[PDB]
Design a protein around this ligand. Structure first.
Ligand SMILES: *[C@@H]1O[C@H](CO)[C@@H](O[C@@H]2O[C@H](CO)[C@@H](O[C@@H]3O[C@H](CO)[C@@H](O)[C@H](O[C@H]4O[C@H](CO)[C@@H](O)[C@H](O)[C@@H]4O)[C@@H]3O[C@@H]3OC[C@@H](O)[C@H](O)[C@H]3O)[C@H](O)[C@H]2NC(C)=O)[C@H](O[C@@H]2O[C@@H](C)[C@@H](O)[C@@H](O)[C@@H]2O)[C@H]1NC(C)=O
Ligand SMILES: *[C@@H]1O[C@H](CO)[C@@H](O[C@@H]2O[C@H](CO)[C@@H](O)[C@H](O)[C@H]2NC(C)=O)[C@H](O)[C@H]1NC(C)=O
Ligand SMILES: CC(=O)N[C@@H]1[C@@H](O)[C@H](O[C@@H]2O[C@H](CO)[C@H](O)[C@H](O)[C@H]2O)[C@@H](CO)O[C@H]1O
Ligand SMILES: CC(=O)N[C@@H]1[C@@H](O)[C@H](O[C@@H]2O[C@H](CO)[C@H](O)[C@H](O)[C@H]2O)[C@@H](CO)O[C@H]1O
Ligand SMILES: [Ca+2]
Ligand SMILES: [Ca+2]
Ligand SMILES: [Mn+2]
Ligand SMILES: [Mn+2]
Ligand code: NA
Lengths: 239, 239
């Protein structure tokens, strides 16, 4: 078995287990701010930021045909403090090719380049999308499962609990090809679920980077916080 | 689309939208005690109780071949007051042929009559299993997805938060055939997930009853409470 795992119950500035990209900072109090917070505490528009675990992850091996099962968990808050215009754009857990740099922002969430469906992306993602783009369902926020496209293969509306912490569980079972995600708000007790078939052998490269990305919007004050308080991950590739 | 749904935020005695079977009772405080609680407040062993919603559910159609999607949610608690003997046996949400009566108790949970994998059972169930029988994985408690057999096709160990309230979400999406179940403990924030492919056409009759069942064990003090505080359900059959 090729097993890999990590776990941050909080973040600490400077620990090179994490590559920070774009606007992402780790505060002194241990919070990963994916998108820029101005000095008055308000979230800035036109901001993109990501973080990746600095170690590659073996997900499948094109010599044995085995596929790795895996699971990630994290806690985040999105606060939408502006009365106008509508908030944007969201945050996302993603798995893609290694050594990746941030892509386009706004509705592509720092992960995609366009609204194309394109096997060249080689990227799996679970999004928490706060702005309804032309390729989106009308309901926001929504969870979505993104396979080689910002146009999710499956979505699920959820109600924001503005500024509260949400717990996320994301799990892939290789044998059934099921990818599931759950969002829980302790503040309210609300529980949301989503699941779809995903053949990661046909999507992901053998090795992948895993990461979190956030983005705010393309006009002034179309913005929200994308703060992350903890992040764990476990992958296990059978022989 | 053919639609049915219900939602009990608490339970009220004498309401005949619910059928109580075996030991099941509704207290004056709105709690559904699936298995018997003695006058001294301790749970009684050798006890089996169930509740069924009193309207059948149209889950699929042989002529059109359409299959309903559905979701159920409930809050329960299991209190295990003794450490010797081991507590038993558990509770379960189940879907099966109409007009059914309690089957065997103990590790069969009031739903099955023995351990065989038999298509004549015509029963689908999500179990919360507290005692490790010969057909069970060694870890208890565990969530299990039971398709025509108390021998689960898929299990997920979880840690009991003894005596505290758990929140369950179970969802079936017809197009993917994914059956998913989530357990959340608000007291601790723990989250557990389980999912598997189920084709309910090969499993269930076209019309089913839905219900809840609990059972305590086969020797003195091998017992635990099986209390349920709320229960909702929704199904939608395309047309
Ligand atoms: C777990 O075991 C339980 C106990 O066995 C099952 O419940 C019993 O299920 C049987 C049906 O298989 C019920 O018996 C029938 O009762 C009806 C109504 O009176 C009779 O008409 C019927 O008899 C006819 O069919 C028989 C063959 O099935 C023929 O042999 C017979 O000639 C008739 O043509 C049958 O009655 C029995 O006939 C044989 C006699 O020797 C016997 O004495 C007589 O009872 C039975 O009433 C029922 N018991 C209870 C407490 O409910 C249970 O089955 C599930 O629920 C029942 C109601 C049905 O819906 C089953 O399809 C269903 O599986 C089973 N539970 C599970 C999940 O397997
Ligand atoms: C997404 O955008 C990036 C940047 O434009 C693309 O990456 C460049 O792609 C070409 C060919 O793949 C390379 O020559 C460049 O060196 C790449 N730049 C970097 C930083 O890697 C990427 O290919 C685009 N992907 C899609 C699907 O459009
Ligand atoms: C001033 C103005 O109307 N600008 C709009 C952009 O806002 C808009 O881009 C979108 O902006 C929203 C937030 O408002 C969000 O960030 C979307 O992801 C982003 O695409 C654009 C739409 O094509 O039109 C501009 O004129
Ligand atoms: C006295 C004694 O050991 N009796 C045992 C039964 O307890 C046992 O049944 C199992 O008991 C546990 C709880 O103790 C649980 O209820 C199981 O579901 C049940 O099957 C049985 C096992 O074959 O043997 C008796 O002798
Ligand atoms: Ca969007
Ligand atoms: Ca058992
Ligand atoms: Mn979206
Ligand atoms: Mn079991
Ligand atoms: Na309690």
């Amino acid at each position: 078995v090729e097993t890999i795992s990590f776990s941050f119950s909080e973040f600490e500035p400077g620990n090179n287990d994490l590559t920070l990209q774009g606007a992402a900072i780790i505060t002194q109090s241990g919070v990963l701010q994916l998108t820029k917070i101005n000095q008055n505490g308000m979230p800035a528009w036109d901001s993109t930021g990501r973080t990746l675990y600095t170690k590659p992850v073996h997900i499948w091996d094109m010599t044995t045909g085995t596929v790795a099962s895996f699971e990630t968990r994290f806690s985040f808050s999105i606060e939408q403090p502006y009365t106008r215009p509508l908030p944007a754009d969201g945050l996302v857990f993603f798995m893609g090719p290694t050594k990746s740099k941030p892509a386009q922002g706004y509705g592509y969430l720092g992960v995609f380049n366009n609204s194309k469906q394109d096997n060249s992306y080689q990227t799996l993602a679970v999004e928490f999308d706060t702005f309804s783009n032309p390729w989106d369902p009308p309901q926001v926020p929504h969870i979505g499962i993104d396979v080689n496209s910002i146009r999710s293969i499956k979505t699920q509306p959820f109600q924001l609990d503005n500024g509260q912490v949400a717990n996320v569980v994301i799990k892939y079972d290789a044998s059934s090809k099921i990818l599931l995600a759950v969002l829980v708000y302790p503040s309210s007790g609300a529980i949301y679920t989503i699941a779809e078939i995903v053949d990661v052998k046909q999507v992901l490269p053998e090795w992948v980077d895993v990461g979190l990305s956030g983005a705010t919007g393309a006009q002034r004050d179309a913005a929200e916080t994308h703060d992350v308080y903890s992040w764990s991950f476990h992958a296990s590739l059978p022989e």
